[PDB]
């Protein structure tokens, strides 16, 4: 009959929705549209 | 009161230990109260907690007035341990209350084990546990009042008044010890983290670093760690004897995940005598750690096991004598399992006898459990290191197999470098570079009959193998092979591999790369812009022009970003241009393909920089950003009265040469607009098809509406959008070049004619929709 | 009586520190009241010592203490205390000297400080100093001032003061031990939680630091703190450097980190702990951000010091907010800023901790706590750099594998060369033809299986072109009647056959010819050898596909060369290196939908086919063959006892392991099946094998600088027949004898080995005639 | 005026195969030789 021995503890350190703030963690006026028209950018 | 005051002042002075051991001051107070109570053999039972089970242990025995402290002190070798369910000291520690029991033989909690051990008769004893912060530190014992029974309530009052001093001393020692253990914990964590973050390593090296670094803060005489085999399944051919039943299945110790308990490596840290580290691969079962069942018991079960007086146990076969002939014997043992994130036991750490010789208590259990927990967390680094090595190896294999597949076979070389048909060697390229030059220079088409210098040249009549031949001819005409010592076989091979690295896409195929390289050649020679560039720079620009769209998949940078392609997650900006640059450099990495092998280190550093600037300068967003700076360069170069002054002005400034080279590479990319209407109409059909299949990919895979340029539904709107491409992007590159040098004047003429035709079809569309 | 009352009042003094929930300042206040009453002095006080920035200071805690005074009125708060550096004031000189200083007239010592004498309007004319020194640290300097009844403190007054200061030292050291225990408990918990959160996953700097700081939040015990991350880009792009080099934009002038990067806080993370416990993140914060409005974070980014400033809005350098920071009435009182430091000393960020939860200034213990936290973050930067390397390596691998697969895959022209739908069905490029019609049109074009001896063991590949090999391979799959049973598309089958062909390199023996001959041997052993009776049609389909792809991408080297050269294959795959490569590449080739010849079978059938592929290709390794020869022999010996063929089918079919072993033996006999070919064909194949092994030996001698084995060595070329005889006597004879016993239909294969052996002996003994 | 005197980082505390012990951290009898002669293994 072995002696009674302590069980490992894990719940305390078991514990990113729970961590807040993890969700979030040049040409001329004419050129800006017509460059996208030809897919230049 | 005067002698009572003197005794109080003596107690106040002995409370001021100023160093030493508090057991001395407590012993002096205990002998004081012993002579005061008319009682003998006062005692202290320290409370320990092991495995979460509380116990009491006698620390000072046979306290007598005028007795020497050395005889009253009992060491842990002779201490008598009682659990809280044995003895009235156990009941007192449980209840935390004052008890006064006469005729202890009538009490249901009195234990005579100490009375039998010592042969002393006890009749009446007083018990009061010392309790601070709800925690019980010691049970104080007053026994066998002489000349009187039942003690007295005033004896209890003076007993409490002296146990106030006892509690003071014990609380001071408790605060000092809790500070010591918590400092040891924090230093252990700081050192283990420092050693874990030093680099990525496998389990063995990282655990060895951490444990060896923290060895000084664990007051163990020795300790070890055993790592279990982590393999979970076997190969089918090693299951075959088991499945056939030719071998009986393994039976014996098994971890909870079911793996076999095989310690594949043991690390011993011996600290009692000489500090020595032993690494034992595949240790036998006779190993002095494994010979006791305790490490294996932890591997099967996973408990933290504190076992005092381990050779007195019956279950575990702990060695009762020296194990290394050095005279070290096992006395106390504390074993803990290291676990994965999945609770899988990777190893078992066993800490042996404490340096102080006291049995392990909950404090050292706490220290070793926090170390073991940190080690079990550290395995993320090992798993990441293994995944790094596997990803690296798989990448290198895939890149080598790709490069082997793409590289031109020796037949493809012999198809052009017809050395076999002219030198009669057929076995070895032992012929000198002059011989290879002489035999090849016949086989290329002459550049005048092919019109390769002319801005008009159309690639439709030529075959793609004729395009390779013409490409080597263009390299010959710049006169690069003789100056930079570019071998002719590696030249032809590199041209063929560059061709084969262009995909069979409708417009970004090898013909587009060849026409861009021919535009680079003709701008250099006939446009006379080579006056600004060294022949080394001309060679680098022509190679970059031939590779500026290498392995272009057939899609736009917007498509790569929208499709979240590996190219887009690898290269943050100029995604395809950086891919073309990376792949052209990869082709130049092979000695077989390095047409720049015979350069100086600084010349390659120069060639690589020209490759970078030219290919990233094939990004039209960069072109649009730097148009204004090129225009300022041309305007400043126009007022110069002398051609040689203009040459000086451009050549002295590296950045102006880089901007002009970027502008040349954009004139080269969009050259088709300047080609005759037949060629322009075909090439515009090719880009329109490429853009249509891009828009079909966008609508089908990405499920988004394409821009009208990408949309097949706006097919008849093609020429009007072509007109819009003619004014916004090409006139400037070409008008400013015609101002810069009049020799590029006809390229604007070609655009002007082509614009009229593009306007004509738009008017034909104006006729069509209005009716 | 004086001794009795003094001892009693010092006992009660000691008990006041045992009252849990009391404060030590109360006990020291009682001690000062007793001291002032006994000594007949007035206005006793104590100055607690602190250390900030590594310099010591003193600050008064109890002023105007007089007998029969209120403790609330005597205690001064840390917001009203008067701070003195050690270089000024008698209290500073006492703290420095750590010894008694008795000065009767303040005007006679230059250490006299007028500051508080003018602050409070009190006149001082007598001073006695002794620091409370414990453990080589000064805790408080106690002061006795203005003896009302005398102009001097005599030596007996010094002795009584020393004894009362010994009791005060006991109280103050008890409080000090409790405070240091609290500090180390905080630091330990900080490190344990930071380690738990860093090893939770591999992530970026921002995520990892936010997890760590948000978990340690409860243990910092600050009212407010934040972290600013600096931009880490060091070099600019050439196109953004062009305006700087030409001069369009003035050079950047402003704050710089010690590395030289511009101080640009690209992200701020604010942790507000004063109320509502809100966290915010500000990307690209403006310079008017309330943390950056004071120069202190920028000063730390420029310099990298640890800055503890008390009364920050009273300083003039940093221009702290004198008013409230925001709409809530929070004002900066104390500040502590520290940098986070990369492995290379680069400043990655700056952590700023504002005023404590209580009013006290930051002591050295909070500096110690915060520096251990910032060191831990500076070490977990290694995990963040590893994560970024991970993503780049994964992307580069996936790009290289896709470009490889695109290069290797057969073009539509190579499909059309076999499946001539266009020239026969009169269909467009788009395949809309029925699968049955595609079957009917293809089945004409393959060579008939009865001509060219496709079922026969005599098959010679020399008179066939490789295009005829592809056609014959599609024919072989076709007779097994797999296309209609398993619904595999005909075009998918043809493309997969052609990409398997181009997969196999142009090596001298492990080219497509060996793969085809092995697939033909699998076909003929199935059909003519009658071994098809042991396997399902799905299993036979797996046998043929694995038999063709068994050697795919074999570079021409053996596993010994892979290990010896430390090849990426050998570092990726531990054992059976080349067969694991063949399996991984065949599975990759089957992974594309366009090449997935098994796309039209059930998931369970795909798992079966994958296990079939694994068994077959790993069983192509001859070391595994040699290991499992004895088991196969036991299978054959057990199978020959039976006198009924149906009994043999039952016996083998019911055990999957026996079928797997016979499959391994089938594939082994298929690989070496050239030894069973006619003598001419054997001689040519053995010449090709010997050439491959000689070029291996020349490679091995050249690039590993080692001696080849005699079988690899080209100098013993003429020794080839003897070693071939060894291969006859050791390997093939067993396989083909056991197969001839197992089925008499495989008997000619052994017989072909039997002739070829005679021919090898007839040329080996002639070598004995040459010597 | 001048800034207050501030403490330098204690880089000296953790500034730092020296760890001892890191240096180290199927067929028949005939089949052991002839198999190597053919490079089969
Ligand atoms: N509309 C239009 N765009 C063109 C034409 N030629 C080139 N482009 C655009 O310019 C880009 C040049 O970059 P490249 O793909 O050659 O590296 C093409 O990808 C395409 O977006 C053209 O003739 N018409
Ligand atoms: N001596 C000899 N070895 C052979 C012959 N054919 C095959 N082998 C061996 O069998 C191996 C089969 O491996 P695989 O063909 O799957 O790469 C070869 O690498 C080679 O070692 C042969 O004709 N003679
Ligand atoms: N021999 C000896 N026994 C003691 C002394 N002090 C206390 N004990 C006893 O040890 C016993 C342990 O169990 P109990 O709690 O029943 O009662 C306690 C006593 O009777 C001592 O000084 N000497
Ligand atoms: N008002 C007041 N002043 C004190 C008290 N105790 C000491 N001081 C004085 O304040 C002075 C501060 O500087 P010094 O060290 O020169 O000398 C100290 C004294 O003279 C006190 O309890 N109340
Ligand atoms: Mg491009
Ligand atoms: Mg093989
Ligand atoms: Zn291009
Ligand atoms: Zn093979």
């Amino acid at each position: 009959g072995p002696p009674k021995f302590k069980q490992r503890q894990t719940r305390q350190f078991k514990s990113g929705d729970d961590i807040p703030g993890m969700e979030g963690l040049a040409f001329s006026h004419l050129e800006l549209h017509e460059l996208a028209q030809f897919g230049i950018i | 009161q005067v002698e009572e005051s003197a005794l109080c002042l003596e107690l106040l002075w002995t409370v001021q230990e100023e160093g030493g051991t508090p057991e001395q001051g407590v012993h002096r107070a205990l002998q004081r109260l012993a002579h005061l109570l008319q009682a003998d053999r006062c005692s202290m039972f320290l409370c320990r907690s092991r495995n979460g089970i509380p116990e009491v242990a006698s620390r000072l025995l046979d306290v007598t007035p005028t007795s020497k402290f050395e005889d009253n002190l009992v060491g842990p070798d002779k201490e008598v341990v009682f659990p809280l369910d044995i003895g009235i000291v156990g009941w007192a520690a449980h209840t935390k209350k004052t008890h006064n029991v006469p005729d202890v033989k009538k009490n249901s909690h009195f234990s005579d084990f100490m009375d039998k051990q010592t042969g002393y008769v006890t009749k009446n004893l007083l018990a009061t546990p010392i309790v601070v912060g709800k925690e019980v530190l010691a049970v104080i014992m007053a026994v066998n009042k002489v000349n009187a029974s039942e003690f007295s309530k005033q004896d209890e009052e003076v007993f409490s008044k002296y146990l106030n001093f006892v509690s003071i001393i014990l609380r001071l020692h408790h605060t000092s010890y809790m500070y010591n253990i918590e400092s040891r914990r924090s230093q252990i964590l700081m050192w283990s983290a420092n050693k874990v973050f030093e680099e990525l390593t496998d389990v063995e090296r990282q655990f060895h670093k951490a444990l060896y670094t923290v060895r000084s803060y664990l007051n163990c005489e020795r300790y070890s760690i055993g790592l279990l085999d982590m393999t979970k399944e076997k190969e089918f051919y090693d299951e075959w004897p088991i499945k056939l039943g030719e071998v009986e299945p393994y039976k014996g110790p098994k971890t909870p995940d079911g793996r076999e308990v095989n310690f594949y490596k043991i690390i011993d840290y011996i600290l009692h005598g000489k500090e020595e580290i032993k690494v034992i691969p595949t240790p036998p079962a006779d190993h002095w750690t494994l010979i006791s069942g305790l490490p294996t018991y932890v591997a099967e079960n996973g408990f933290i096991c504190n076992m005092m007086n381990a050779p007195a146990d019956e279950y575990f076969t702990f060695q009762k004598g020296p194990v290394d002939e050095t005279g070290w014997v096992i006395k106390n043992v504390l074993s803990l399992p290291i676990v994965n994130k999945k609770e899988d036991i990777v190893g078992v750490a066993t800490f042996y006898n404490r340096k102080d010789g006291k049995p392990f208590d909950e404090h050292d259990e706490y220290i070793t459990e926090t170390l073991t927990q940190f080690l079990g967390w550290s395995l993320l680094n090992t798993d990441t290191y293994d995944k790094m090595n596997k990803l690296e190896n798989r990448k290198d294999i895939a890149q080598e197999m790709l490069m082997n597949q793409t590289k031109a076979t020796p037949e493809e070389i012999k198809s052009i470098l017809k050395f076999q048909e002219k030198l009669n060697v057929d076995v070895i390229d032992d012929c000198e570079e002059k011989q290879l030059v002489a035999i090849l220079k016949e086989d290329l088409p002459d550049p005048r009959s092919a019109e390769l210098y002319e801005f008009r040249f159309s690639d439709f009549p030529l075959t793609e193998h004729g395009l390779i031949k013409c490409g080597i001819r263009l390299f010959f005409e710049i006169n690069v092979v003789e100056k930079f010592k570019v071998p002719v076989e590696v030249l032809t091979r590199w041209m063929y591999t560059v061709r084969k690295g262009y995909r069979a896409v409708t417009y970004h195929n090898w013909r587009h790369g060849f026409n861009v390289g021919q535009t680079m050649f003709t701008l250099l020679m006939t446009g006379r812009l080579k006056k600004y560039y060294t022949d080394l720079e001309a060679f680098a620009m022509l190679a970059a022009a031939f590779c500026h769209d290498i392995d272009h998949r057939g899609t736009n940078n917007l498509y790569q970003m929208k499709s979240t392609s590996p190219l887009a997650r690898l290269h943050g900006s100029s995604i395809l241009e950086r891919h073309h640059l990376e792949y052209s450099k990869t082709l130049l990495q092979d000695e077989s393909l390095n047409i720049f092998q015979n350069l100086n280190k600084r010349q390659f550093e120069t060639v690589i920089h020209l490759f970078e600037v030219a290919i990233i300068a094939t990004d039209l967003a960069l072109y649009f950003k730097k148009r204004t700076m090129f225009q300022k360069i041309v305007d400043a170069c126009e007022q110069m009265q002398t051609e040689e002054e203009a040459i000086k002005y451009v050549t002295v400034d590296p950045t102006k040469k880089e901007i002009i080279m970027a502008m040349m590479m954009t004139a080269c990319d969009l050259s088709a607009i300047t080609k005759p209407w037949e060629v322009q109409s075909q090439v515009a059909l090719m880009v329109a098809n490429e853009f249509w299949e891009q828009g079909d990919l966008e609508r089908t895979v990405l499920q988004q509406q394409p821009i009208p340029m990408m949309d097949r539904n706006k097919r008849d709107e093609l020429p009007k959008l072509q007109v819009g491409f003619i004014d916004f992007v090409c006139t400037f590159v070409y008008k400013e070049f015609s101002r810069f040098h009049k020799e590029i004047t006809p390229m604007l003429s070609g655009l002007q004619n082509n614009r009229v035709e593009w306007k004509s079809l738009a008017d034909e569309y104006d006729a069509k929709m209005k009716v």
Side-chain angles (χ1 to χ4, degrees), chain A, chain B:
Chain A
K4 183 178 179 180
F5 293 142
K6 183 208 286 280
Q7 236 163 304
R8 267 190 297 107
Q9 258 90 72
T10 58
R11 178 58 195 143
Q12 301 191 19
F13 285 115
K14 203 165 295 174
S15 80
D17 54 314
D18 197 33
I19 294 130
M22 294 300 293
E23 76 289 355
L25 217 60
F27 329 108
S28 65
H29 45 78
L30 167 71
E31 312 237 9
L32 188 62
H33 185 47
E34 290 248 357
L35 292 203
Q37 163 159 349
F38 297 102
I40 299 316
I41 53 179
Chain B
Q1 276 68 75
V2 200
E3 55 196 318
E4 187 256 350
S5 176
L7 264 72
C8 290
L9 296 184
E10 281 264 278
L11 256 74
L12 291 192
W13 192 241
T14 199
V15 158
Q16 186 146 11
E17 296 271 313
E18 286 177 14
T21 88
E23 274 94 335
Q24 297 188 19
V26 182
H27 171 277
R28 263 54 145 201
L30 280 184
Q31 87 192 8
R32 218 65 51 177
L33 190 33
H35 81 66
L36 284 165
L37 287 157
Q38 288 284 340
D40 69 349
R41 272 158 164 74
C42 307
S43 172
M44 279 193 359
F45 285 84
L46 312 164
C47 180
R48 266 188 286 96
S49 182
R50 317 200 336 267
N51 314 279
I53 310 309
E55 298 170 326
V56 297
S58 54
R59 180 54 163 167
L60 40 71
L61 280 185
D62 308 333
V63 172
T64 306
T66 68
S67 81
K68 41 171 284 195
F69 167 67
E70 304 274 359
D71 281 337
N72 282 194
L73 199 73
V74 311
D77 299 283
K78 256 186 186 31
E79 74 178 344
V80 191
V81 182
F82 298 113
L84 251 67
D85 49 23
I86 285 168
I88 194 134
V89 298
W91 197 241
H94 196 315
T95 191
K96 303 180 190 66
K97 284 319 198 186
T98 296
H99 290 5
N100 194 350
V101 52
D103 194 15
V104 296
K105 305 275 167 198
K106 293 196 180 343
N107 197 289
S108 50
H109 296 282
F110 162 72
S111 175
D112 77 355
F113 177 81
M114 177 99 85
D115 291 43
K116 262 66 187 173
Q117 165 70 99
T118 57
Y120 184 70
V121 280
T122 67
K123 190 220 172 255
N124 301 359
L125 62 80
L126 188 42
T128 305
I130 301 314
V131 187
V132 289
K134 88 162 61 63
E135 165 162 357
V136 196
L137 298 195
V139 164
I140 197 61
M141 291 264 75
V143 307
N144 281 10
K145 190 178 192 172
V146 316
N147 301 310
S149 288
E150 216 57 37
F151 279 108
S152 181
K153 276 230 162 173
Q154 67 226 32
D155 272 1
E156 302 192 328
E157 187 61 50
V158 70
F159 206 56
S160 307
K161 183 178 179 180
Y162 276 79
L163 286 195
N164 274 343
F165 300 94
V166 177
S167 305
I168 280 282
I169 304 190
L170 293 190
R171 88 176 290 240
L172 260 71
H173 195 37
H174 197 55
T175 41
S176 305
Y177 199 71
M178 294 292 268
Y179 172 65
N180 293 337
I181 69 104
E182 214 62 42
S183 164
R184 292 210 316 264
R185 184 172 170 228
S186 85
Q187 294 224 262
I188 283 182
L189 292 178
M190 209 57 201
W191 278 118
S192 304
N194 179 53
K195 293 300 168 193
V196 164
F197 294 125
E198 217 163 42
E199 61 172 357
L200 283 182
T201 40
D202 49 325
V203 159
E204 307 159 288
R205 303 193 60 218
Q206 199 181 66
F207 281 13
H208 185 34
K209 263 188 303 182
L211 288 177
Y212 178 63
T213 293
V214 146
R215 73 187 151 74
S216 311
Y217 305 98
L218 299 150
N219 285 106
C220 306
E221 293 177 350
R222 73 176 62 207
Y223 59 98
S224 63
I225 186 191
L227 300 165
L228 306 184
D229 200 311
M230 288 312 296
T231 64
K232 202 162 299 296
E233 329 291 340
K234 277 160 89 158
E235 303 286 314
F236 61 89
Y237 57 74
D238 291 336
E239 264 206 325
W240 285 349
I242 306 312
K243 295 259 277 293
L244 286 194
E246 307 198 314
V247 154
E248 260 271 18
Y250 168 82
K251 64 186 55 55
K254 299 234 294 175
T255 311
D257 39 328
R259 319 194 318 288
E260 307 182 15
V261 183
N262 183 238
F263 292 86
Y264 82 91
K265 196 154 296 175
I266 289 277
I267 308 106
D268 303 336
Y269 319 84
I270 298 160
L271 319 173
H272 181 42
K274 293 179 179 179
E275 278 184 351
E276 178 232 21
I277 300 327
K278 314 211 218 166
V279 172
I280 320 293
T282 60
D286 51 56
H287 189 267
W288 66 268
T289 303
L290 263 53
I291 186 50
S292 48
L294 192 52
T296 316
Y297 187 91
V298 180
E300 322 186 287
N301 296 337
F303 317 138
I304 298 154
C305 316
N306 198 313
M307 179 163 22
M308 67 173 309
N309 223 19
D313 202 11
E314 294 141 280
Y315 196 122
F316 302 107
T317 86
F318 276 100
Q319 312 95 302
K320 306 199 175 22
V323 304
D324 280 272
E325 299 95 8
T326 190
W328 187 79
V329 309
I330 291 85
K331 200 164 276 270
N332 317 311
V333 203
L334 178 60
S335 300
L336 315 94
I338 313 191
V339 312
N340 287 7
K341 207 171 211 302
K342 323 183 305 177
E343 272 212 23
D344 282 9
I345 311 192
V346 155
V348 170
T350 293
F351 304 92
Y352 287 97
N353 309 339
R354 200 209 277 187
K355 284 273 186 61
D356 322 304
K358 290 180 157 354
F360 285 97
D361 46 32
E362 50 179 0
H363 306 137
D364 289 345
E365 290 177 25
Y366 195 46
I367 300 316
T368 57
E369 193 168 19
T370 66
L371 171 63
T372 285
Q373 273 181 228
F374 183 88
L375 290 193
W377 295 341
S378 172
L379 299 188
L380 172 73
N381 283 27
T382 297
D383 300 340
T384 303
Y385 175 70
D386 264 335
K387 280 199 10 177
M388 289 271 281
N389 291 0
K390 265 54 175 176
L391 274 190
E392 172 189 288
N393 290 311
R394 277 186 172 100
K395 188 207 56 163
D396 297 353
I397 293 157
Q399 292 197 308
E400 180 273 351
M401 301 182 344
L402 165 53
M403 163 84 105
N404 175 259
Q405 269 288 319
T406 305
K407 189 178 303 195
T409 67
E411 224 292 342
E412 304 262 56
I413 287 177
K414 277 156 41 185
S415 303
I416 294 190
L417 191 67
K418 294 182 172 301
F419 74 96
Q420 313 223 125
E421 315 184 356
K422 291 180 175 54
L423 301 186
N424 203 83
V425 199
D426 309 278
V427 58
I428 309 165
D429 285 44
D430 66 357
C431 52
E432 296 197 328
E433 200 188 315
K434 280 84 175 184
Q435 296 170 265
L436 291 174
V437 165
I439 63 193
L440 193 59
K441 274 183 178 172
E442 197 304 338
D443 200 63
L444 300 323
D446 50 338
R448 298 315 181 171
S449 81
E451 289 192 3
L452 286 175
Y453 280 86
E454 184 43 63
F455 290 19
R456 162 184 68 261
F457 177 80
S458 67
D459 56 291
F460 294 94
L462 296 198
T463 66
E464 309 205 328
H465 206 50
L467 301 190
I468 307 160
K469 272 183 256 200
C470 291
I472 305 126
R473 179 63 89 187
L474 301 185
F475 279 99
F476 267 150
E477 285 301 286
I478 301 204
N479 162 2
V480 305
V481 294
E482 280 89 22
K483 315 183 62 60
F484 323 76
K485 307 159 295 308
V486 182
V488 191
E489 172 144 274
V490 320
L491 176 75
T492 299
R493 194 171 34 235
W494 187 81
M495 246 47 61
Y496 222 135
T497 56
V498 167
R499 151 156 144 70
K500 275 198 292 160
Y502 284 90
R503 285 180 198 214
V505 205
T506 85
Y507 173 75
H508 296 121
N509 63 325
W510 172 236
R511 273 176 155 114
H512 172 59
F514 177 79
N515 267 12
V516 170
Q518 190 270 349
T519 315
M520 195 43 58
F521 175 77
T522 196
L523 285 190
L524 279 175
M525 299 292 105
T526 305
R528 331 258 173 221
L529 268 58
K530 204 221 164 299
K531 64 174 60 167
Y532 308 112
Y533 302 110
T534 306
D535 287 87
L536 174 49
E537 292 171 285
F539 185 38
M541 315 177 16
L542 198 62
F546 280 119
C547 306
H548 82 293
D549 284 335
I550 190 161
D551 217 10
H552 195 295
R553 277 83 184 291
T555 54
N556 208 351
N557 293 359
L558 260 288
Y559 187 86
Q560 312 304 91
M561 285 189 322
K562 289 164 140 47
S563 197
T564 70
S565 64
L567 291 180
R569 286 181 313 119
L570 177 58
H571 307 287
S573 65
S574 304
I575 291 158
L576 267 164
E577 294 62 41
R578 289 188 186 285
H579 177 227
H580 302 313
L581 181 66
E582 182 165 278
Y583 194 31
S584 315
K585 287 183 187 182
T586 300
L587 284 199
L588 296 176
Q589 281 324 107
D590 255 353
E591 165 269 297
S592 323
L593 262 49
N594 194 353
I595 57 168
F596 300 114
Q597 58 199 354
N598 290 303
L599 295 193
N600 319 318
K601 201 196 75 186
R602 188 173 182 167
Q603 301 172 297
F604 198 86
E605 284 186 302
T606 301
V607 161
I608 287 315
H609 189 50
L610 272 89
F611 250 71
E612 172 158 329
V613 65
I615 299 183
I616 304 311
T618 324
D619 191 326
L620 292 197
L622 202 154
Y623 151 77
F624 270 103
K625 288 170 41 193
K626 310 304 159 174
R627 273 198 314 173
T628 322
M629 319 214 329
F630 174 60
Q631 192 178 12
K632 273 158 179 187
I633 291 171
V634 161
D635 285 346
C637 215
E638 182 181 66
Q639 285 135 46
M640 326 216 88
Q641 305 92 357
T642 316
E643 172 196 60
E644 296 137 308
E645 173 174 49
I647 298 180
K648 288 154 35 216
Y649 170 84
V650 199
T651 309
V652 64
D653 206 346
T655 59
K656 294 174 191 151
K657 294 212 304 178
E658 287 180 14
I659 295 153
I660 290 170
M661 180 192 328
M663 297 310 334
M664 294 199 15
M665 196 84 45
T666 281
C668 302
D669 216 0
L670 325 179
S671 304
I673 308 287
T674 79
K675 298 300 174 84
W677 172 243
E678 280 64 31
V679 173
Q680 165 58 22
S681 71
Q682 312 305 133
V683 173
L685 280 185
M686 306 181 194
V687 283
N689 290 124
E690 174 133 18
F691 294 155
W692 289 342
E693 320 329 291
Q694 161 126 357
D696 291 333
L697 267 179
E698 275 172 14
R699 76 155 74 266
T700 302
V701 177
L702 270 42
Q703 297 271 347
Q704 58 188 307
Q705 168 69 0
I707 52 194
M709 165 156 128
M710 283 330 160
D711 194 3
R712 288 178 157 280
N713 304 309
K714 315 302 179 54
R715 160 186 301 98
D716 321 278
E717 218 189 79
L718 166 64
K720 182 260 287 174
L721 287 167
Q722 202 78 23
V723 168
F725 189 86
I726 293 190
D727 67 4
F728 195 24
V729 190
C730 311
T731 249
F732 179 98
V733 57
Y734 287 119
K735 171 167 41 62
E736 301 284 319
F737 270 106
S738 300
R739 290 208 307 131
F740 188 41
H741 279 356
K742 27 167 271 293
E743 300 93 281
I744 313 97
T745 296
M747 302 211 47
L748 180 55
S749 110
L751 177 63
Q752 275 172 359
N753 183 72
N754 295 5
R755 196 190 196 270
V756 178
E757 293 279 33
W758 292 118
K759 177 55 69 206
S760 177
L761 297 194
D763 298 357
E764 302 304 289
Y765 200 40
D766 207 342
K768 209 150 291 159
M769 294 300 293
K770 199 66 168 293
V771 303

